Amino acid sequence: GAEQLQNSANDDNICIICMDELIHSPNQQTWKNKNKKPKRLPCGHILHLSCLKNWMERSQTCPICRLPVFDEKGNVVQ
Ligand SMILES: [Zn+2]
Ligand SMILES: [Zn+2]
8 A cells, every 4th residue: 555666557467466477278278387377356357266266365356346255264154
């Protein structure tokens, strides 16, 4: 908070969490470890699965649109 390094953009191929490349081929695996697989959200966003988890441990939300995503467990119910 209160600290920026000019980084303030929106991407569809980059995990804003760490600003690392995030995308995958339809029949090839751009990333070896499945830990950072392109996990897509219900709202329509994609973040590295590991980074998404790291963020959700502190705030279960989309750090992009701020919408209320599913619980840290991945399956909210009421
Ligand atoms: Zn990431
Ligand atoms: Zn979202």
